[PDB]
Amino acid sequence: LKCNKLVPLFYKTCPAGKNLCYKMFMVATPKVPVKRGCIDVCPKSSLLVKYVCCNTDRCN
Numbered sequence: 001l002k003c004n005k006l007v008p009l010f011y012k013t014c015p016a017g018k019n020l021c022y023k024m025f026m027v028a029t030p031k032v033p034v035k036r037g038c039i040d041v042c043p044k045s046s047l048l049v050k051y052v053c054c055n056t057d058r059c060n
Helices: none
Strands: 001-004 012-014 018-025 031-037 050-052
Touching: 001 031
Parallel strands: none
Antiparallel strands: 001 012, 018 031, 018 050
């Protein structure tokens, strides 16, 4: 399993680390992404920070 990351590079792998790849956006006002990595769940979501999880591979 591999996805993209904010780290200065391109995409990383998360086979043993996790099994999914989600992103963390912020709706403070200007709207902007800030936390994208791999997770095993997606129990987060409000009105001042969104998140996009995916497990199709190459979809992140």
